[PDB]
């Protein structure tokens, strides 16, 4: 089940943020959130979709192996951070959209649709273009669904080889310590339109000693100056819960 | 092929220390070292053996899976950092000797001996006690051999499932950034005499952007105060190579 902790809304009100944090100890059957209504509301996954897309890319053979280098041959890209050769992990961690847009094209509608059904990934709507359905198309996923999906990944229970799940998991390590390990992925759909804000994400899980905590955060956003809030608000909530001080 | 870099002896000489650093770019077919003769000399692996031990424990089912918890029975251990339940990653990173002595016994000699031949691990001599051959027994391995073994692990080419090579690899992650990942493990056999000295190790590999560097360091320890040099000497060489930063 899931519990509503209204105390957590303090971290949101202090910054006038409309968002939701979902936090789960040990498993998906012991979770809490600041907002039950928004916890199950479905939003564009934006770059958080690079997690399933990479798994599907390895499954289908589009990504030959974990050692494949995605070369940059000089085609101008929307951010200089993407204008370089990238590993699979690098492409994920810098959110190299063009790399994963080409992966999407090579996977194709049929295989993409099949794996999203197998992963129970959101509304499973890939309309809007095979290389943009997760960013400006019709794909939507809730914070609870992200936690469920990531828990499956952590347990190697996605319908894919354990090998490929493990490959993507190390690619998601963002903080490493002897008894403290974080897998996570951020997302940002843009600033949105007039009275249609964008969405920003932070999702992943934390392994502290022999315990695990899955989490998913999203917020409405209409300016890039608010991006750091997608990390600081959830980090403060987790710090409050003793998930490392 | 291995190249000698005489300039890399600066720090060794200034501290009056006998040791070797082996550093390889892309593959073990492009290695350089400060001392060609010592690069091939074999030494007690000490805790660096936890890497092969961890893999063998998984291959044989002694370690159930990536989520195995090693319980602390509450009776005293030599170090308070070990008096707790630990993941496989935790066991490796805090170098929990008693956990890996128990692993070895369950593996047994027939299978340990088998896998050390499969891995081409040093002189493959596990005399000295099934739970101590790598600490005070007859097992010996060279810096060159460590690099070869670690390269095989990086490539998933060891005679073991890719599954378990991937499990142990994430367990070895020590530093993480979007385009910089480090797998490494230290080891130290204890202070010896000026004539029969101990050995201190640093081994691992650095993934920087799309490049990979394999390294193995060891040094003779006949005074406990020289042990910090096991990190600073190789760190200085890798800084001068432009790998760090
Ligand atoms: C994914 O959602 C988009 C890209 N991935 C990320 C992300 O969520 O980290 C963004 S946000 C980009 C990262 N560095 C920039 C920054 O920090 N400032 C401008 C302050 C913003 C990308 C937009 C995908 C749609 O490209
Ligand atoms: C395994 O080899 C033993 C541990 N390995 C290490 C080591 O290589 O560092 C030590 S020494 C202890 C832990 N790290 C500290 C250090 O490096 N400095 C203080 C400089 C000291 C152990 C002996 C395991 C069998 O205990």
Give the CATH number, domain containing residue A237.
Answer: 3.40.710.10
**Closest CA in chain A for residue B209:** A86
Nearest to B143 by CA among B199, B200, B218: B218
Nearest to B189 by CA among B202, B205, B181, B200: B200
In angstroms, the separation between the Cα of residue A196 and the nearest Cα of chain B is 31
Structure tokens at B213: 């560097």
CB contacts of B162 in chain A (<8 Å) are 163
Where do we find the tokens 């192996």? A65
Cα–Cα distance between A79 and A13 in angstroms, integer? 32
Residue A116 CA, ligand 1 centroid: distance in Å: 24
Where do we find the tokens 């790598």? B134
In DSSP terms, B185 is beta-bridged to B203
Nearest to B216 by CA among B20, B26, B2: B20
Nearest to B101 by CA among B49, B64, B164: B49
Enumerate the H helices of A43-161 as residue ranges: 50-60, 88-93, 97-119, 143-154
Cα–Cα distance between A123 and A137 in angstroms, integer? 12
CB B140 within 8 A of CB B42: yes
Interface probe with A: pick from B80, B87, B175, most Cβ of A within 10 Å: B87
Cα–Cα distance between B201 and B20 in angstroms, integer? 10
In angstroms, the separation between the Cα of residue B207 and the nearest Cα of chain A is 10
Nearest to B217 by CA among B39, B46, B54, B94: B39
**Reported structure resolution in angstroms:** 2.1
Enumerate the H helices of B47-142 as residue ranges: 50-59, 88-93, 97-107, 109-118, 133-136
Structural domain for B235, as ranges? 1-245
CB contacts of B179 in chain A (<8 Å) are 86-87, 90, 93-94
Q: What are phi and psi of A97, to 5 degrees?
A: -50, -55
Cα–Cα distance between B92 and B99 in angstroms, integer? 9
Q: At what angle do helices A143-154 and A162-171 cross, to 10 degrees?
A: 120
- What's the domain count of chain A? 1
Query: Which are the contacts of B54, defined by CB distance < 8 A and separation ≥ 6?
Result: B63, B88, B91, B92, B100, B103, B168, B171
Nearest to B214 by CA among B50, B60, B23: B23
Structure tokens at B65: 């899976």
Q: How was this structure determined?
A: X-ray
Cα–Cα distance between B217 and B208 in angstroms, integer? 19
Q: Best substitution site from A95, A136, A191 to test ligand 1's pocket, by max atoms within 8 Å of Cβ?
A: A95
């Amino acid at each position: 089940s899931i519990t509503e902790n209204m105390s957590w809304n303090k971290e949101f009100s202090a910054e006038a943020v409309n968002g939701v944090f979902v936090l789960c100890k040990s498993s998906s059957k012991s979770c809490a959130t600041n907002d039950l209504a928004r916890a199950s509301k479905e939003y564009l996954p934006a770059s958080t979709f690079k997690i399933p897309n990479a798994i599907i890319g390895l499954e289908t053979g589009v990504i030959k192996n974990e050692h494949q280098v995605f070369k940059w041959d000089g085609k101008p890209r929307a951010m200089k951070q993407w204008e370089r050769d990238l590993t699979l992990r690098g492409a994920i961690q810098v959110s190299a959209l063009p790399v994963f847009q080409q992966i999407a094209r090579e996977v194709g509608e049929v295989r993409m649709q099949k794996y999203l059904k197998k992963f129970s990934y959101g509304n499973q709507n890939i309309s809007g273009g095979i290389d943009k359905f997760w960013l400006e198309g019709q794909l939507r996923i809730s914070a609870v669904n992200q936690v469920e999906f990531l828990e499956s990944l952590y347990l190697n229970k996605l319908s894919a080889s354990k090998e490929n799940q493990l490959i993507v998991k190390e690619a998601l390590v963002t903080e490493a310590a002897p008894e403290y390990l974080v897998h996570s992925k951020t997302g940002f759909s843009g600033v949105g339109t007039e009275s249609n804000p964008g969405v920003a994400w932070w999702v992943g899980w934390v392994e502290k000693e022999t315990e695990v905590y899955f989490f998913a955060f999203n917020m409405d956003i209409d300016n890039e100056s608010k991006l750091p809030l997608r990390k600081s608000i959830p980090t403060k909530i987790m710090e409050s819960e003793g998930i490392i001080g």
